[PDB]
Structure 1
């Protein structure tokens, strides 16, 4: 299921900071991500429309660590739902549990969130869960199992969380590193860089 291979080389194929690895930094920048993506990256590519739109799809699909087929499922349901597909799609997509574990900050990356959720540590509404794709409902509490507490990783992620600025649409008390989700973010409060409709006509073939 998981990709398993170097992450930031795929991240530098687009030349973007995909937040695949964090720690002290977000992207190292000093790893020559833009100048030499590959053996022939020294010469600037121009890349046709299918390449830019698909390559962007690659980007977003990688930041959320989803596969193509259930991503297409997210597409078909997004079209099935009433209203704008792009906006409500992205909103529910941010509702994904790994993303929420990331924004609450107890987790170096959404992939680390895959690790910790995979290790049974997460407990939502007094129930254990595994899948990172689950979209938590608004005004729903989530907690980490008390035995997961005390690991050095969680706090060491928390200093990064505070530095990242943390979501405003979610309220994490962090008194027991247990936060409550509030509601799915509106298009205006986020990104202002990715353009979702590219992906939607990209699947209009």
Structure 2
């Protein structure tokens, strides 16, 4: 593997939020942010194609937490399945089990939804799945195992379900902490800061 280390220094690069933080607030105030990662990022130039194709692959790949081994295989199961591989790439990243623990809201962000599925706290259909790559299917419960319920940062993570906006392709019973992966999203339910087809542009050079 996972990216670990400094997560303040991540979000300057590409530009937006990317949701990689620590508590209850927002984006971009206590780490004095107006500038660029690099050797000297105080003068710029030439924000065009290849380096923005490679921003576009590497913006997605730092949200979800894949490395390029898994991510290039997600290009394979896009170009294998029929029709619209740019959206196929994003549905595969949204059916991911540590992504859904975020999209259900039982986890704080994805890198503590990765670490919450991995310590065997999430059940899918009455079992234990601890792989944060388990593709979930249309109509699976994604519940929480009943040994990690009274540990409060599970429940303390449930409040930005309302404050980040409703996801509106799950349903989640907060009484038993048990979601239901209702269906996969399509490319109007995902944020518009990403350019889905500029990863397909970064394949044959």
Task: Give 2:76's aligned residue.
Answer: 76
Task: Give 2:58's aligned residue.
Answer: 58
3-state SS in 2 of match to 1:110: coil
Task: Give 2:157's aligned residue.
Answer: 157
Structure number having the greater helix percentage: 1
Task: Give 2:192's aligned residue.
Answer: 192
> How far does the alpha carbon of each residue in 1:19-51 deviate from its partner, in whole angstroms, 9 at most, with x for none?
011522232334233324344111134334211
Task: Give 1:130's aligned residue.
Answer: 130
> How far does the alpha carbon of each residue in 1:115-157 deviate from its partner, in whole angstroms, 9 at most, with x for none?
1111111111012111111110011112111110011101111
User: Where in structure 2 are there 5+ consecutive unaligned residues?
Assistant: none
The answer to whether the aligner puts 1:115 opposite 2:115 as a matched pair is yes
CA contact (8 A) 2:86 2:196 kept: yes
**Counterparts of 1:16 and 1:6 in 2: how far apart (Å)?**
16
3-state SS in 2 of match to 1:141: strand
> How far does the alpha carbon of each residue in 1:51-74 deviate from its partner, in whole angstroms, 9 at most, with x for none?
111012111101000010221111
CA contact (8 A) 2:123 2:145 kept: yes
CA contact (8 A) 2:171 2:181 kept: yes
User: Where in structure 1 are there 5+ consecutive unaligned residues?
Assistant: none
**Counterparts of 2:174 and 2:193 in 1: how far apart (Å)?**
30
C-alpha change, 1:199 and 1:88, in structure 2 (3 Å) is: same
CA contact (8 A) 1:105 1:166 kept: no
CA contact (8 A) 2:56 2:195 kept: no
3-state SS in 2 of match to 1:29: coil
**Counterparts of 1:26 and 1:61 in 2: how far apart (Å)?**
21
C-alpha change, 1:155 and 1:45, in structure 2 (3 Å) is: farther
Q: Name the TM-score, length of structure 2 as normaliser.
A: 0.93
Superposed CA RMSD in Å reads 1.6
